[PDB]
Structure 1
Amino acid sequence: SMEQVAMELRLTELTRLLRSVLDQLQDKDPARIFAQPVSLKEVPDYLDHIKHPMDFATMRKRLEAQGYKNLHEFEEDFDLIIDNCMKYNARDTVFYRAAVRLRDQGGVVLRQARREVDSIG
């Protein structure tokens, strides 16, 4: 149906906007601490601690399959990146600190992304 196509075009345009958002958030991680999944070879207990691991490569795979239906879903995954790190790692670590700085810097990007999502529809 034409209605189905129109909905598909809206999801495509959302995907474009989310890709730009993703790029901007990942620029706020110049150390590439959040770029890839925590390796279970290197941190074998990780899944005892963290029940829903997340990282930027995993988000990018979801995104390119148009797997984010709205901005809330994308933000949920971004928050997992931060929140998982802040639980597993202590306050005195480069990991935790990186997460805090990513959260603080990413909030600015996401604030305007929400306005754009609402504005364009």
Structure 2
Amino acid sequence: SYDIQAWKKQCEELLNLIFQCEDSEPFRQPVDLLEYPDYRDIIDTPMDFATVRETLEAGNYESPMELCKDVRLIFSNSKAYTPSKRSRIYSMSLRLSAFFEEHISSVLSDYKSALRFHKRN
């Protein structure tokens, strides 16, 4: 497909699948500072899947690369806030990251291919 717009619905569907994963539940809404009072000492830019979905639905992503950067920030924040690489919530992040990367690969490839076809002449 050379459809330059198709990534948006493909990302909406992938976010729906991520919301059906039990592994996403800790990453759905902005982190709880009352539970994790040091969190914002450690993490410069909070990110969560509800923020990503709202940004997409507002029309405030230009490309699936930008959405991918925010989703990867959810996972780097978990890797950097975790007190242990054997932690429950951290291990949930690693499985969910593998699922996300498996699905986003085609979305990025198709978008970049569509843009190259648009600029072919």
TM-score band w.r.t. shorter chain: 0.7 to 0.9
**Distance (whole Å) between structure 2 residues aligned to residue 60 and residue 39 of structure 1:** 19
Identify the match of residue 40 of structure 2 among 37, 41, 47. 47
Amino acid at match of 1:67: N
Q: Which among 61, 65, 71 is matched to residue 72 of structure 1?
A: 65
Alignment partner of 1:33: what SS? helix
Q: Secondary structure at the match of 2:66?
A: helix
Structure 1 gaps of 5+ residues are: 1-9
- Report the alpha carbon displacement of residue 113 of structure 1 after superposing the two structures with TM: 1.2
Percent of residue pairs identical: 29
Quick check: 1:61 aligned with 2:24?
Answer: no
AA at the equivalent of 1:80? L
Tell me which moved more, 81-90 or 12-21. 12-21
Once the two structures are TM-superposed, the CA of residue 64 in structure 1 deviates from its matched residue by: 1.1
Partner Cα separation in structure 1 for residue 70 and residue 88 of structure 2: 21
Question: Contact 2:27 / 2:74 at 8 angstroms: preserved in 1?
Answer: yes
1:34-92 superposed Cα distances (whole Å, 9 cap, x missing partner): 11111122212211100011111111111110111111110010001111001111211
* Cα separation, 2, equivalents of 1:41 and 1:50: 15
Change (3 A) 1:66 1:13: farther
State the partner residue of 1:116.
110
Structure possessing the higher relative contact order (Cα contacts under 8 Å, 6 or more residues apart): 2
Q: Is the 8 A contact 1:21 1:113 kept in 2?
A: no
Maintained 8 Å contact 2:61/2:67: yes
Aligned CA RMSD, in angstroms, stands at 2.1
Q: Which runs of 5+ in 2 are unaligned?
A: 116-121
What's the TM-score once normalised by structure 1's chain length?
0.79
**Which residue identity does 2:103 align to in structure 1?**
V
TM-score if structure 2 supplies the norm length? 0.79
